[PDB]
């Protein structure tokens, strides 16, 4: 009398899966479909390091704030890291028109070189480019201004009609940022440009706008009684941009020749940047996985798994775990 | 039916418990185990691999005068979150049912293979076991494991033992 | 197999019909009915409770100069509508098919338990019925029904009345 039996494998595992008809089913083997681990670093997407700005935001870096000269400008980046406590940008108060649009275009650049579009010593012999400093933008305790801009003041007692043009012939889009100062009092306008009624004109093939400065008193922000609107315009290669003003033109000296990429974002996080490579990015730290779902953060940049509200997504692989 | 699993079985998912005059223990069926492992590995790889996500950035930035488009983007993200959460939990639950039912069916067709092979030469005593009427040594009992059992060699001995 | 259901059962989804000298009637199998009721209730509650929505406002307002953003919002709403309608319809039909197959599996499992318990002591006459070769009393009926049938006690009587 011999006995042959049929049975199945059991482990000491306590991995419980959830099924439709039954919850909390202990199985022999399970495979997690949910990723809940991150490295706690801000890595490089597609092998290109991000652009960390530190205490500066995008406006302070792209306008040349005096607190942002220590930052390095790389040839290319994949995304932009901004500290949540960063407050260094637009030291002189006013509105940055289409700020978020420019932040979207500057999210990923494959080739970013900075050049002097208009040299300070060889473009304006008729205008004063040295007294354009203010207490809104201090540098080592002294008065300074934006690095990428020049606040042109009258040369003695005369601010004549201004006319400058830049020819783009380097095969890349050139981004040009300028500003229009709005003095609080007409005495400030007489002290700065001496013409009580001025205008600013910036024109291109696609861009054409005539700016009139507005002379009225405002609430005092950073000890400034008047505002300053900052504008921007991409310039196609083989095209030119003209600057024309009786006054109130804060004219670029450095412009940026960029070739842009698509599909990037800006991360607001305190997570430090480390030398690492991931295909997925997250403000809490990068994700390196192949599972289709994750529950770390909704805002992800890269080829990232779909964010779910789940806490446990385990797929059963082996049999039921019934030891007896 | 079969009450519990075998913690002494490590060579495979599916197998046997031989016992005769000269031995007892366990001997896992390698073919059915390897087929089930390949099938459920393809199941997990098919769930994982069919998700192809393009290069994208979820977050968008809006100022104080784009509250409607900000709420539109938040509504888009929350609807995607609800769709993906419901589909993920329901896919996990239905696929876990189908995996466990696949395991129970593998148990039952292994039982059916040995039952259809043995015929009247053994006795069904419950919990997947067969008590042999004849003398079936380890060559015999190993030959039952794969599908090379000679019924008429032991049929007369089982007929004499049954009555 | 089993052609039709029985209206006379009230307390159970599954059960037995015994007919002997002392009478007849319908007795429900409480274990399988309670297991099926718990599993089906957990299945339904798994369908509802995975809908983890948040607070939201679906409707957006626009002026006449934001027709493109309005059409984007309508495209978002129609895509969410199509996804949820297709997923809900296919989910309901697939789970209805799985529920009917589960009930058929419970019927076949009860039949397999009874058929493996009785063995050769009864005839398989069809329509889910076993006629006993021996005089199976009422105590014999619920000895079958709680899983403690005495096969060799009635084996001699079943062999006598078989031929």
């Amino acid at each position, epitope marked *: 009398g011999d006995t042959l039996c049929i049975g199945y494998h059991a482990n000491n595992s306590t991995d419980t899966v959830d099924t439709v008809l039954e919850k909390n089913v202990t199985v022999t083997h399970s495979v997690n479909l949910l990723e809940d681990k991150h490295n706690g670093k801000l890595c490089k997407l597609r092998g290109v390091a991000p652009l960390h700005l530190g205490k500066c935001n995008i406006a302070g870096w792209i306008l040349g704030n005096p607190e942002c000269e220590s930052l390095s400008t790389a040839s290319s980046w994949s995304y932009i890291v901004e500290t949540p406590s960063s407050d260094n940008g637009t030291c002189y108060p006013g509105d940055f028109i289409d700020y978020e649009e420019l932040r979207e275009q500057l999210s990923s650049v494959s080739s970013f070189e900075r050049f002097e579009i208009f040299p300070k010593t060889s473009s304006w012999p008729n205008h004063d480019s040295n007294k354009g400093v203010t207490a809104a933008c201090p540098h080592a305790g002294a008065k300074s201004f934006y690095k990428n801009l020049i606040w042109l003041v009258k040369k003695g007692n005369s601010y004549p009609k201004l006319s400058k043009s830049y020819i783009n012939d380097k095969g890349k889009e050139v981004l040009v940022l300028w500003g229009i100062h709005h003095p609080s009092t007409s005495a400030d306008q007489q002290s700065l440009y001496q013409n009580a009624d001025t205008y600013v004109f910036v024109g291109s093939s696609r861009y054409s706008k005539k700016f009139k400065p507005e002379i009225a008193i405002r609430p005092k922000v950073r000890d400034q009684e008047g505002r300053m609107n900052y504008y921007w315009t991409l310039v196609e290669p083989g095209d030119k941009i003209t600057f024309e003003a009786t006054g109130n033109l804060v004219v670029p000296r450095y412009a940026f020749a960029m070739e842009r990429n698509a599909g990037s974002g800006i991360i607001i996080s305190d997570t430090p940047v480390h030398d690492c490579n991931t295909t997925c990015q997250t403000p809490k730290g990068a994700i390196n996985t192949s599972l289709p779902f994750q529950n770390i953060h909704p805002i992800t940049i890269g080829k990232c798994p779909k964010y779910v509200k789940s806490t446990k997504l385990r797929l059963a692989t082996g049999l039921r775990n019934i030891p007896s | 039916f079969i009450e519990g699993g075998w913690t002494g079985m490590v060579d495979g998912w599916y197998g046997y418990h031989h*016992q005769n005059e000269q031995g*007892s*223990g366990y001997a896992a069926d390698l073919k059915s185990t390897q087929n089930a492992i390949d099938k459920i590995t393809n199941k997990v790889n098919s769930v994982i691999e069919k998700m192809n996500t393009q290069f994208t950035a979820v977050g968008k930035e809006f100022n104080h005068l784009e509250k409607r488009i900000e709420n539109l983007n938040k509504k888009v993200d929350d609807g995607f979150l609800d769709i993906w959460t419901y589909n993920a939990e329901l896919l996990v639950l239905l696929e876990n049912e189908r995996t466990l039912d696949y395991h129970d069916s593998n148990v039952k067709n292994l039982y059916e293979k040995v039952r259809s092979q043995l015929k009247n030469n053994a006795k069904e*005593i419950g919990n997947g*076991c067969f*008590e042999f009427y004849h003398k079936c040594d380890n060559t015999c009992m190993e030959s039952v494991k794969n599908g090379t059992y000679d019924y008429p060699k032991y049929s007369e001995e089982a007929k004499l033992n049954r009555e | 197999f089993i052609e039709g259901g029985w209206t006379g059962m009230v307390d159970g989804w599954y059960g037995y019909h015994h007919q002997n000298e002392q009478g007849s009637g319908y007795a429900a199998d409480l274990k399988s009915t309670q297991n099926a009721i718990d599993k089906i209730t957990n299945k339904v509650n798994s369908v509802i409770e995975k809908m983890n929505t948040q607070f939201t406002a679906v409707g957006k307002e626009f002026n006449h100069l934001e027709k493109r953003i309005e059409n984007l919002n309508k495209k978002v709403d129609d895509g969410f509508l199509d996804i949820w309608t297709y997923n809900a319809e296919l989910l309901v039909l697939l789970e209805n098919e799985r529920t009917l197959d589960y009930h058929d599996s419970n019927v076949k499992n009860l039949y397999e338990k009874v058929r493996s318990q009785l063995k050769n002591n009864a005839k398989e006459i069809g329509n889910g019925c076993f006629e006993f070769y021996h005089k199976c009393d009422n105590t014999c009926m619920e000895s079958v029904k709680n899983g403690t049938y005495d096969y*060799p006690k009635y084996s001699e009587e079943a062999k006598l009345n078989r031929e």
Partner: antibody
Amino acid sequence: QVQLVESGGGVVQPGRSLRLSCAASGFTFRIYAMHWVRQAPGKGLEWVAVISNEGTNKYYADSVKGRFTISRDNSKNTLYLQMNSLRPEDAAVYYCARDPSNPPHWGNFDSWGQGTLVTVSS
Amino acid sequence: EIVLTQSPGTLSLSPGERATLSCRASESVSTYLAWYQKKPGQAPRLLIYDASHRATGIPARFSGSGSGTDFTLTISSLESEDFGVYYCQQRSNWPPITFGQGTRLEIK
């Protein structure tokens, strides 16, 4: 509770035939497998034989193979053991014990009996 | 057969302390190992089965360990009724069931 009362022990010459019995009560005899365990004087416990719950397959130890025959009566709720041509090493105290599981999980001994002494002497 | 060698052959300990009892195996029995007790004149008693599960009516002071070759039985508190001769049980590869030679646990 479970009760296992043994009987049939005594003094027998070598080469004769002896039979023991083990009366069971308080539980269903026909669903639990049955055993016999002996302990020789000056030795340890030695397993003797096993019968199933329906009494179909039978195993004996290597020393007592061929000479021994286990049997049971499920109607009378009584286990048995038969010897032919006993040995001087066969003299021991014999315990009947209950297997708490089935031919899937044969093995250990949940309940025991008082036991009877077999004295094989001339 | 899977022979079962018990070491040491005699454990002499005072009541109230820890006791250990080993039973080596020639073949790995996975976890299917049990232990037994034997008073002089009384019936044997099943304390632990499958090397981790204690039986009903057994005090919690008895506990076993081991998986495969080496198996040990540990008594947390030696009371006055714990003295006797102890045996180890294999059930993995049995056409014969093989016991250990025994460990006589006494009063010193």
